[PDB]
Amino acid sequence: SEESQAFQRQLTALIGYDVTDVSNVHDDELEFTRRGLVTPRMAEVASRDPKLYAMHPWVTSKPLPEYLWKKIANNCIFIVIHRSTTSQTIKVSPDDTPGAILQSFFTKDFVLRVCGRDEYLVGETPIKNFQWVRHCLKNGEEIHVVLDTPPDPALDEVRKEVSLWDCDRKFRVKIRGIDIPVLTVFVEANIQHGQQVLCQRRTSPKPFTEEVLWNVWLEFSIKIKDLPKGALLNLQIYCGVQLLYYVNLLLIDHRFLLRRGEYVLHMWQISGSFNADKLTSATNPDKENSMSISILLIALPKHQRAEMPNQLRKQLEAIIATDPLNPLTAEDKELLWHFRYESLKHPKAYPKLFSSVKWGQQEIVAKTYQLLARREVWDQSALDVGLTMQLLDCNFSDENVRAIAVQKLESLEDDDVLHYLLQLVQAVKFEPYHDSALARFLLKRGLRNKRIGHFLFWFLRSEIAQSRHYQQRFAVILEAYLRGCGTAMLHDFTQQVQVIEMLQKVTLDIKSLDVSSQVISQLKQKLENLQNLPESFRVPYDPGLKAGALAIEKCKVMASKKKPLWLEFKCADPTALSNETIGIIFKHGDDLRQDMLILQILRIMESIWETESLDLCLLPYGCISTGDKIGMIEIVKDATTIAKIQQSGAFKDEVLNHWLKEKSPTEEKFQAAVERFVYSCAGYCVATFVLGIGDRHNDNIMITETGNLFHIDFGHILGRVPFVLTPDFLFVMGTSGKKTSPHFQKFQDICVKAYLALRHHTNLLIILFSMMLMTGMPQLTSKEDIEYIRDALTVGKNEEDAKKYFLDQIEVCRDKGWTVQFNWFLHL
Amino acid sequence: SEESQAFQRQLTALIGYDVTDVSNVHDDELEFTRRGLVTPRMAEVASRDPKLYAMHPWVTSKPLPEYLWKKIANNCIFIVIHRSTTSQTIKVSPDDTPGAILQSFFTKDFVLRVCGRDEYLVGETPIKNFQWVRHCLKNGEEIHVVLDTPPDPALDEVRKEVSLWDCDRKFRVKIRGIDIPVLTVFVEANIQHGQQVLCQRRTSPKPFTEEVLWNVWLEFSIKIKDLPKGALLNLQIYCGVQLLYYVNLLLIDHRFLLRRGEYVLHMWQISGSFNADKLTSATNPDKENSMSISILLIALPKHQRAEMPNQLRKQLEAIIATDPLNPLTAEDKELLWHFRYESLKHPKAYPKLFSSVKWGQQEIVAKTYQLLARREVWDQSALDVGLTMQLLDCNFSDENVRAIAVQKLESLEDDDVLHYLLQLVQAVKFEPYHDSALARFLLKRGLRNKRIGHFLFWFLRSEIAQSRHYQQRFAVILEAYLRGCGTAMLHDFTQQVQVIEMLQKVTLDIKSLDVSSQVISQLKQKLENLQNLPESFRVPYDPGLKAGALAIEKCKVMASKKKPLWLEFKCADPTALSNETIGIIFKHGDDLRQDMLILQILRIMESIWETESLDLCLLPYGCISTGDKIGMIEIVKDATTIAKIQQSGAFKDEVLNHWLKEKSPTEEKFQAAVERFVYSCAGYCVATFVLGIGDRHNDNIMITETGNLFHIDFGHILGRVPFVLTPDFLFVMGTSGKKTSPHFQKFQDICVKAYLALRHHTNLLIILFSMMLMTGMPQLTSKEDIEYIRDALTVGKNEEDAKKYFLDQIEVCRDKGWTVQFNWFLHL
Ligand SMILES: COc1ncc(-c2ccc3nccc(-c4ccnnc4)c3c2)cc1NS(=O)(=O)c1ccc(F)cc1F
Ligand SMILES: COc1ncc(-c2ccc3nccc(-c4ccnnc4)c3c2)cc1NS(=O)(=O)c1ccc(F)cc1F
């Protein structure tokens, strides 16, 4: 067709990559996946509710936090409904539905929409179970909604559309040669399966030149029939010993066919590390410069007790109780496997049990499938996200194992998927094949809910624009989502990408030119030209918010070396309750993906703290990676850095407390800010400690006028003191040197409650941390790196040792005063 | 009948107890056993060869020892056949049969009989495989046989002849009271099974008087259906804590009936010890004085894999490799039981595996029987006597387990049964029931071979006359044997018992009267009266030898406090090659049973040494226990004590070497005596060390004129230096203080070869030692007692540490010289 052309081109433009381009594939897997994904797409689209999809209510089934209760006077919540010019304040009960609310208003068709936002309070859900309502309560804000007409669902219209088990020969592969357009070397051939090296063979070392031939058959010890679905041929080049290049080939393809024939693979260049890029089946796109290797190489079929000696059960339980990062000895595996049927009665033994499987033996793999067939304890088990995540990491290449993980994820409510979306999108990198159950799950949940969909779009598009290793795979999944999300979101994404693309250019043109008066007249000039750009666009980190017109006079070039744009937008929603502008930092030169991850962990940390009636007042500002080393960041209102305050490398102790009094008009407020400070401070001390990012210079720590403390720029320290608890912070709590005070004792108490809380989720955090390092920090992918968090969470320790451990830390910060901040200033 | 009367009375007179007397039984088990034993008796009698039974060839299938080879010149052995007055020396080949020999003699009906002995060289056996022939060779004696006529087999004529598994109630027993014709006390009720206490209940303590009543029901935790065949109700009385009396009752009888009703049991008096008397089901016969207990109390039915984790197989093998006296932890048992089918592939795991059985659970016991049903590795296994003995000790009460032990014993040749007869007879004490497979086995093997039979008679009769705990059981078995052994042996036993009974009296009458001239005229007088006594009788420790007339002039009263008779007899066989008299010590006042055991171990030690081409020249003189604290001992010819030599408490170093020169007429002989001394010395050092009986006073060590050293009186030290290696012994080897010599180096070498040899039979010796202490040393029955031999045999050590261990010992003896012998003299 012709309209399909100017539509596939639109898709490409949103995606940022051409899913038709076949200049870099050695098979048809990507294409097959495009087709395969049609069914799940159409299934979800066809069975989605029109009205609920249009309005996308943001709700939760969780209980209302205790601290959120202590803010409700006599089971009454006031809801101010605005019609056109007027407004009526109403008594509502937390337990009643919006439907009810409306009928109790007509006494003194339509649907309640949050004022100045694309957020609807609608559906058969208690007003208390709406996130927006919980947000207002938390901040002590007033709940304002307008009486508008339901969005026309027609705007969400979707456009019209020999057996392997018989070959007993040893596997072998011929290494022809290696070529590079521009020391001795050898090629190493590994047959891997989920980080496990099944078998390995090397070549003879040969003088390294622009072309090295071998023409040798490498015969492995593994029989062709013992090859597992998902096994990689891992080709690596060493020089003399150090790894220079690598590349991977799936030995069994997406149709269960053994791999056969001639291959010239373009390899990746290197910069025992656990980097997820090392696993990719994709070949390097840069054919011109890249090193390449030449190799020369039946379908896989499908599958269809004495009481334990007490001491063995003790040993088994001991093992199952260890942490995810706890290494299994061959003795442990032999035991887990020998007693596999007992192990299966424990959902928590699963990650370790399937790590005890000899995937290199077709008979063992078969018995394993027989295990998963007696899947009743697992299927009936209460969803455990940390446990489910462990089955989705780099240590599992089997699609049935990984599939029972995704199966458990289906019970997640939209609110929880949002909590784990980013890390789930990242976990797609550990999938052997492009079309996996995990991928389909992401796709289905994005199509079912606009909010998840919106972030799915930016998480994918973020990876596609800066990950050559995985962009092809991600681009296909993004396409499947764009073809089912609907006409209105398409138009919205189109608008958002256009705006960002325009703001990118300006950022680049301003950069190539400290902050002079000329560079300022050029920022203002370029902005004036652009504004003369969509009349409105959604904010990617806060999609309910629509930004509109620029406030050029408030725009500027910040004073860092990266010359970030500080932008200010008017809210395009007239029904907005304020004139406060939307503040967006636009930054080029950094890979903001790592920040997104840290911030997202912080959000997960807060929910853990909520399940324990705790609110450490963190501030995970919005941060979205939009392209190659560019992105945008939420400007937190009324905020100033701790360094700028002191600046008013000398440091004063009272200066901070002074600054709060100044900004608090009354005493009730100063005291409430001094509380906020104590909570937000403890929140960031505990958080940063766990994530090993506490030792920051105070230039990187900020504070709101209402006393809310919060760290910033988490990529900088990922690119001694356990955390920043400096005198000025302590002074606010009212303490000097060897002393104590009503707040300091409070602060000490919140920490230990925060700390011990997190430790109740050791495994979930260990897995999330491990995965964060393998998919976002190609630099921080060492064994000793990952195992930092085990120490920081005092694994194995009881709550007394742990408590006394953290307190010792808090002391280290005091005994060291300004010593570390002072060094941090010294410019050597 | 009437002839049966004067024949049952004869049996009683041989037995030394009336198997008809029912004045001491609470059931009919003994009687039932008398009847039960008829079949095995008649089976063996009916199927025994007349001629071979009459002549009882003493043969062996073992190879001729290497040292026995080096005594055969050019495959020729000379055999001097005597007819009447003449004699012909003949060339014979070691490999040819006696049948052959005869045909090679008529050239230059009948049967060859050793001169002056009831010993025949007959049958289809190589002349080399006759023990007599091996004896002559060993001693360098000349083989003299006479051509006599075959013994008439007619002389061997034999005279003409609710279910338990349904009762689910807890077992209980009522303790009425305790009575004694002549502090507080209580009764303790144990349900035991093979030294294992299944369940235990006590009474309330009550003031100890001549009659104490309780009238209380003791309810145990064990269900009636879980009671194992062979379980004992073990009633014990404690005073305040110390055990005073005990008695046992089989809870399930010989017909598989549960025990029911009223019992008054007469209990045994005491003198955590492992005494075999404590296990007896017999009641005390001394009704007049003995303490007794009153108690008040359905038939037992009959019965009809993932590879091991390497580490578990390692652990299992580790366990199975330990020694018999090595204690199993509950962890070990749980493992052996969990992996019972693997354990069954190892005959050596058997003792430990059946010690890992919960006999107190009818379901476990049942599975165990299912194990023994897959008895193929065991049944095909090469006979291991030590292993078979472990299944017959105090730790096994189950008749099926114990029965597979006796089954393995059937493959023993007569020569080997003789080696183990004594300890097998003792092991009958560990049998729960009177009619056991072990008992039948003994009976069958005694009836099949006259020599075994002869010793069977004296071993039984020894126990019957000094063991009230087991005499009833033993007396029944003896009766079964006497009714099938034949008319000639009956007459012989009759003769032997008469002689001994006469010699006993004289010993008693002489005792009640140092050595005066009057007591001498009274010994001679009493002997003169007796001789005016069978004209001939067999020597119980050497049955082939027939003693006849006394040599009164050589008779005397030895100079010990026990006033033993030193007797001298003429050999009643005219065809004897000498005029040397038979020398027999007749001793009253000692329990000679312990000696018999030690000596018998020494004999077992020599056979072990033979299987390793070694001959340490021990001298296990004959010693038979004939009655209550009486017995007889072989006088070793041309022998004098080491003390009497020195006496010629001062000690001289050369005196011993001097004594040898004196007695050796030539130099060739002195040198051959100095060799004999070095071997016999090392033999006794190693032996005594292992049995913890080395530290003897030299009054208890003797030497033959041909240099053969040998210890005596082994009951004395069972009633510091590791062994007697005194200067005088070392001088003979040619050494003084810090020195060495051709012999000393030799002696050191033989020891280590002797020692390491025995260690190859650690288990066999440990079991034999353990059993020797539990059936013969009521005094030496402690845990630390039994486990002495583990240390002396350096269990677990390799042959280097062991070798260097023994050498250190040999040194201890030198560094201490006469120090210990000197103290041994000091009369404090
Ligand atoms: C990705 O790294 C970042 N992470 C976070 C932020 C960030 C986020 C939210 C905010 N809300 C309010 C105010 C500010 C603000 C304004 C002016 N001065 N300071 C902070 C603010 C900054 C910026 C960056 N990048 S950055 O702007 O170059 C930069 C880097 C390091 C540094 F210490 C300072 C920086 F300004
Ligand atoms: C059961 O205890 C024994 N074990 C063994 C023998 C025994 C055995 C064989 C023999 N062959 C030849 C010569 C003698 C012999 C003659 C004279 N003097 N000494 C030994 C000899 C002794 C005796 C006893 N009992 S004993 O005769 O009372 C006795 C006890 C301790 C003691 F040192 C001395 C004793 F003479």
Coordinates of N, CA and C and ligand atoms in Angstrom, one line a residue, chain B residues 558 560 562 564 566 585 587 590 592 595 621 623 633-637 639 641 699-700 702 710 712-715, ligand 2:
Chain B
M558 N 52.8 -79.3 93.6 CA 53.5 -78.1 93.2 C 53.6 -77.1 94.4
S560 N 52.8 -73.8 94.8 CA 52.0 -72.6 94.8 C 51.0 -72.7 96.0
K562 N 47.9 -72.6 95.7 CA 46.7 -73.4 95.3 C 47.0 -74.9 95.3
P564 N 48.6 -77.2 93.4 CA 48.2 -78.0 92.2 C 48.9 -79.3 92.2
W566 N 50.9 -82.1 90.2 CA 51.7 -82.3 89.0 C 51.7 -83.8 88.8
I585 N 49.2 -81.0 84.7 CA 48.9 -80.3 85.9 C 47.4 -80.3 86.2
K587 N 44.7 -78.6 88.6 CA 44.6 -77.4 89.5 C 43.2 -77.1 90.0
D590 N 41.0 -72.1 90.7 CA 41.0 -71.0 89.7 C 39.8 -71.3 88.7
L592 N 39.4 -71.5 85.2 CA 40.4 -71.7 84.0 C 39.7 -71.3 82.7
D595 N 41.7 -68.4 80.9 CA 42.9 -69.0 80.2 C 42.5 -69.6 78.9
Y621 N 49.8 -74.0 75.2 CA 49.6 -75.3 75.9 C 48.2 -75.6 76.1
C623 N 44.7 -76.4 77.9 CA 44.1 -76.0 79.2 C 42.6 -76.2 79.1
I633 N 45.9 -78.8 82.9 CA 46.8 -78.0 82.0 C 47.9 -78.9 81.6
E634 N 48.3 -78.8 80.3 CA 49.4 -79.5 79.7 C 50.7 -79.0 80.3
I635 N 51.5 -80.0 80.8 CA 52.9 -79.7 81.2 C 53.8 -79.7 79.9
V636 N 54.3 -78.5 79.6 CA 55.2 -78.4 78.4 C 56.6 -79.1 78.8
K637 N 57.0 -80.0 78.0 CA 58.2 -80.8 78.2 C 59.5 -80.0 78.2
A639 N 60.8 -77.8 80.3 CA 60.6 -76.4 80.4 C 60.9 -75.9 81.9
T641 N 61.1 -72.0 84.3 CA 60.7 -70.6 84.3 C 61.9 -69.7 84.3
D699 N 58.3 -64.7 86.8 CA 57.9 -66.0 87.3 C 56.8 -66.6 86.4
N700 N 56.2 -65.8 85.7 CA 55.1 -66.3 84.8 C 55.5 -66.5 83.3
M702 N 58.1 -68.7 80.8 CA 58.9 -69.9 80.8 C 59.7 -70.0 79.5
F710 N 57.7 -68.9 76.3 CA 56.2 -68.9 76.4 C 55.6 -68.5 77.7
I712 N 52.7 -68.0 80.8 CA 51.8 -69.0 81.5 C 50.9 -68.2 82.4
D713 N 49.8 -68.9 82.8 CA 48.9 -68.4 83.8 C 48.3 -67.0 83.4
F714 N 47.4 -67.0 82.5 CA 46.8 -65.8 82.0 C 45.6 -65.3 82.7
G715 N 45.1 -66.1 83.7 CA 44.0 -65.7 84.5 C 44.4 -64.8 85.6
Ligands
LIG2 C1 46.3 -71.5 85.2 O1 47.5 -71.1 85.8 C2 48.5 -71.8 85.3 N1 48.8 -71.6 84.0 C3 49.8 -72.4 83.6 C4 50.6 -73.3 84.3 C5 51.6 -74.1 83.7 C6 51.3 -74.6 82.4 C7 52.2 -75.4 81.8 C8 53.4 -75.7 82.3 N2 54.2 -76.5 81.6 C9 55.4 -76.8 82.2 C10 55.8 -76.3 83.5 C11 54.9 -75.5 84.2 C12 55.3 -75.1 85.5 C13 55.8 -76.0 86.4 C14 56.2 -75.4 87.6 N3 56.2 -74.1 87.9 N4 55.8 -73.3 87.0 C15 55.4 -73.8 85.8 C16 53.7 -75.2 83.6 C17 52.8 -74.4 84.3 C18 50.2 -73.4 85.7 C19 49.2 -72.7 86.1 N5 48.8 -72.7 87.5 S1 50.0 -73.1 88.7 O2 50.6 -74.3 88.3 O3 49.4 -72.9 90.0 C20 51.1 -71.8 88.4 C21 50.6 -70.5 88.3 C22 51.5 -69.5 88.1 C23 52.8 -69.7 88.1 F1 53.7 -68.7 87.9 C24 53.3 -71.0 88.3 C25 52.4 -72.0 88.4 F2 52.9 -73.3 88.6

